[PDB]
Write a structure and sequence with these properties.
part of a larger assembly, 5 chains, A alpha/beta (213), B mainly alpha (267), C mainly alpha (293), D little secondary structure (11), A: 213 residues, 8-stranded mixed β-sheet, two-stranded antiparallel sheet, B: mainly alpha, 14 helices, RNA-binding, Something about silencing protein 10 (chain D), Nucleolar complex protein 14 (chain C), S-adenosyl-L-methionine (chain A), rRNA-binding (chain A), ribonucleoprotein (chain A)
Chain lengths: 213, 267, 293, 11, 229
RNA sequence: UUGUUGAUUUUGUGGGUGGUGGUGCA
């Protein structure tokens, strides 16, 4: 069955892409990009460094294309830096190209939902806590945190529960975006990790732990 | 006599070797009089030059050096002279790892009950000694007790039992540094110095955590310090800024003879 | 005075009132120096209100207070250079406490806390502590620095040094503690002391200037209570707790042996045994560095 | 030193 | 129980190069890379940005997507093993151009400046560092074998091939040898691009895998197998 | 204090507010 926020009993691997830098600007509304819109954002006064929706696409692509998603044990949630929280249906097949992705997200932010004939992408009300499974372990990705084996971490963790990982798609910032909801922060690799690679690392471990293959 | 023996007396003797017994007796002096406890420190300078000139051996010489080091040494004014002599002794190429390990353990134990100035002096001194004798980094860091994420569960169990059964083998009362078993111990005291109240002293104490990139530390830049220097340094702060107050409020500042900031001190 | 020269009334009133955050402090310290044993209760009333007023003046004019305070640490140091303990008085003890009330004690660096902690540590070591008056002054100095570190829990080596000499001073030597440097061998407590009566551990400040066996016991009990608190808060967390408490453990063991009835040394020893049992004394590991890319 | 998701400089 | 070494300070592991053939390493080849340039200024041909031009060229535009190569290079380069200096990347362009990717490089994550780099690389044949000390991206002479290590195991990613566990595979392989992987950045096609060079072809998962996902999955197993962390 | 005017401002101390906002609904 396709996993949904309504279902809470089933164990699943929830991934939250916090601090996602998605924003629409009209001169027609178009997703703001670090390279496409440099002068316009300079007028806004915001740094072009923190104007990269591209990182979210890479995390989404590797997560969506991961085997566990093909096994129907994964759901993706995205918390935009503006405060917009987005639900990602596992069944979706987001565009592989960056430009076509931006056209999708501007529609989702304006239309608040994407329906192709269940909404493929749905904007849902904050906080994250309500939508997550009733029994669930929460962790963030922290470089300064102790390095932990993902496979061992999931194995020692219970079964009826579910696992949440909060990954910061922000280009640069303090790892305190989701301290309020989380109970502990763990380190995945001994070396600094990009948002995409860490997600690739973690879903790989869950696949090994749960024998998804 | 001992202060001027090395310079104004020994070179003018035809056979200065005859001073060995007097220097030996001066070097072995043990008396209940506090002012007489400094005598071996002075006799060491006169005793050292004699061995250098004629290649004499003082029996168990480094054993007596270990004995002389004591809490009094850091407070006596002649500490500078002693430390300059110590650098020459601990520059020898034949010293055993146990000997240097025994010294480093004792100084760290002594720095525990020391003023910040003495702690400022010892910390570079220990860093130099550890760097000089590479076998002794075990003293700061024992790898067998590290918890590695890749270590297999049986290794974890063996590590757990190993942690449980460990006992500190350093002997404080043993006067033979080669037998104090200090090499098998560790310098928790320096790790406690990491939490020293003075910020700079803590930073020097944090130095053992970070890698030993720097080759050596000039003792001359750390020998001359005291409480007065710290107080004098704060007496002249180049920058002045608004202080941060206590948001908490205490009804009374001292105890009586609601909220008391200093219980046990009557008003 | 504050009413007559409010900021709104005229220009420069702000600067004037700032100078009075300074003046009122030297009044707070001055009143403490003055004799108040006759009217301690009234002196308590006038004091806490005056300190309460200084809080409001400080809140708006923190800068002027620090300037006057720092001049006071400079003044105490200079007076200490020539007069040693004779310079020290109740007001200096009180001044350090007012600093704790008003200034952020729990900071790595602070304009007034850092000089106060360093200056007090100099007293904790340099002062002979060869008289019951002098020991009593040191005992309160331990209390003040202890409250300075109530959150921070930083290690003060001089607290250990002071405890060792004071504990050994009241047992004078036993010939087992030569590493501890005493300054007075005539303060050894008599053996006939009961050590079962309920004696108050509080030390009056007004008695300090005037400064028999019971007073020594009360001072001694206050010192050990501070020692017990220091074990329970700071030294337990430190990696070298066993090393810190071993010289103290021997001294407390001597206290129990000489005074079997005296219970406080036994209690501290029992807690010390509990802490060392639970703490895992493992070889230190600090050189484990992060691999580089 | 570049780290994580920091991008190469834009001129 | 043991004394620490002479120098415990962590030192950067050597940057692997084609010249060195002894050291064990994980070779990855993103075969059938779709990288082509054309004057309009020279621009990397794209499936979406350019459609009329490739039709004039007569090439099927479905196999005209360099982003798949971009995404793989990002994950391969950003993988911890690359940070550990145990990985070098090789690129066999669909036209037959073989490219050297120095592990030290840092490709842009934006797709536009990604293309701007390769138009420079394809025409200038090489790319120099900002500090001007080493050529990060260099074109090299075919065949791949001469550049590969003397003792190396060769495998391809095949959906039809039997499914294996990467961690077990790397463990059972010897130590002195090296493992070399042929990945098709192509969208769709027959998995025979490197049949001539390889000896045996392996499948990683029963479900179909994207090129980047397959590469990321493979490298994590090597890190788990080699304890790279 | 104003571009000749007259208590509108000026000096110091405290001090809140997105608000000629837009847009969708009844």
């Amino acid at each position: 069955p396709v996993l949904t926020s309504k279902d809470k009993i089933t164990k699943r691997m929830i991934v939250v892409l916090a601090m996602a830098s998605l924003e629409t600007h009209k001169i027609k509304y178009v997703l703001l990009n670090c390279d496409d819109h440099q002068g316009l954002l300079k007028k806004m006064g915001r740094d072009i460094s923190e104007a990269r929706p591209d990182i979210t696409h890479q995390c989404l692509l590797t997560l969506l294309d991961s085997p566990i998603n093909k096994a129907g044990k994964l759901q993706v949630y995205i918390q935009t830096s503006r405060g917009i929280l987005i639900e990602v249906n596992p069944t979706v097949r987001i565009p592989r190209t960056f430009k076509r992705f931006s056209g999708l997200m501007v529609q989702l932010l304006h239309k608040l939902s994407i329906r192709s004939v269940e909404k493929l992408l749905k904007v849902i009300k904050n906080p994250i806590t309500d939508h997550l499974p009733t029994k669930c372990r929460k962790v963030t990705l922290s470089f300064d945190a102790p390095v932990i084996r993902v496979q061992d971490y999931i194995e020692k963790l219970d079964d009826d529960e579910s696992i949440c990982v909060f990954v910061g798609a922000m280009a640069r910032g303090k790892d305190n975006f989701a301290d309020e909801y989380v109970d502990e922060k763990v380190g995945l690799s001994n070396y600094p990790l990009s948002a995409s690679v860490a997600c690739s690392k973690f879903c790989h471990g869950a696949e090994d732990a749960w024998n998804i293959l | 006599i001992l202060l001027i023996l090395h310079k104004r007396i020994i070179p003018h003797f035809h056979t200065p070797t005859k001073l060995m017994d007097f220097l030996t007796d001066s070097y072995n002096l043990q008396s209940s009089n506090k002012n007489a406890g400094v005598v071996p420190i002075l006799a060491l300078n006169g005793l050292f030059e004699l061995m250098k000139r004629f290649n004499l051996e003082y029996p168990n010489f480094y054993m007596k050096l270990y004995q002389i080091i004591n809490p009094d040494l850091m407070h006596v004014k002649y500490r500078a002279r002693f430390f300059r002599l110590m650098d020459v002794f601990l520059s020898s190429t034949h010293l055993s790892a146990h000997l240097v390990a025994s010294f480093i353990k004792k100084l760290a134990r002594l720095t525990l009950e020391s003023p910040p100035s003495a702690i400022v002096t010892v910390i570079p001194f220990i860093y130099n000694l550890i760097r000089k004798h590479p076998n002794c980094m075990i003293m700061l860091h024992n790898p067998a007790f590290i918890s590695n994420p890749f270590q297999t569960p049986d290794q974890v169990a063996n590590l757990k039992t190993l942690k449980e059964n460990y006992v500190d083998p350093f002997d404080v009362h043993e006067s033979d540094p080669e037998l104090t078993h200090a090499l098998d111990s560790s310098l928790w005291e320096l790790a406690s110095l990491m939490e020293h109240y003075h910020p700079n002293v803590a930073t020097l104490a944090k130095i053992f955590a970070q890698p030993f990139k720097k080759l050596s530390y000039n003792m001359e830049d750390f020998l001359d310090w005291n409480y007065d220097s710290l107080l004098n340094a704060e007496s002249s702060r180049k920058l002045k800024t608004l202080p941060t107050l206590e948001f908490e409020a205490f009804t009374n500042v001292f105890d009586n003879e609601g909220n008391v900031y200093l219980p046990g001190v009557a008003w | 005075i504050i009413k007559a020269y409010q900021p709104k009334l005229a220009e420069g009133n702000k600067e004037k009132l700032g100078k009075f955050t300074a003046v009122l402090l030297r009044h707070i310290i001055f009143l403490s120096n003055q004799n108040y044993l006759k009217n301690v209760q009234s002196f308590k009333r006038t004091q806490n209100a005056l300190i309460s007023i200084l809080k409001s003046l400080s809140e708006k004019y923190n800068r002027e207070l620090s300037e006057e305070c720092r001049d006071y640490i400079n003044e105490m140091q200079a007076r200490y250079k020539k007069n040693h303990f004779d310079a020290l008085s109740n007001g200096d003890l009180v001044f350090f406490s007012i600093i704790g009330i008003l200034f952020s004690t729990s900071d790595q660096y602070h304009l007034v806390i850092t000089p106060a902690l360093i200056l007090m540590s100099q007293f904790l070591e340099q002062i002979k502590f060869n008289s019951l008056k002098r020991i009593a002054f040191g005992a309160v100095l331990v209390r003040i620095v202890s409250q300075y570190q109530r959150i921070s829990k930083r290690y003060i080596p001089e607290v250990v040094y002071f405890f060792q000499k004071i504990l050994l001073t009241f047992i004078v030597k036993p010939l087992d503690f030569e590493n501890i440097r005493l300054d007075s061998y005539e303060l050894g407590l008599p053996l006939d002391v009961d050590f079962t009566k309920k004696r108050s551990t509080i030390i009056p400040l007004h008695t300090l200037s005037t400064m028999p066996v019971d007073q020594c016991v009360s001072v001694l009990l206050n010192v050990m209570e501070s020692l017990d608190a220091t074990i329970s808060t700071v030294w337990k967390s430190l990696p070298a707790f066993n090393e810190i408490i071993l010289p103290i453990q021997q001294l407390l063991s001597a206290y129990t042996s000489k005074y079997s009835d005296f219970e406080k040394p036994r209690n501290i020893l029992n807690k010390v045994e509990k802490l060392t049992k639970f703490t895992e004394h493992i070889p230190l590991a600090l050189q484990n560095h992060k691999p580089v890319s | 030193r570049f780290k994580g998701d920091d991008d190469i400089p834009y001129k």
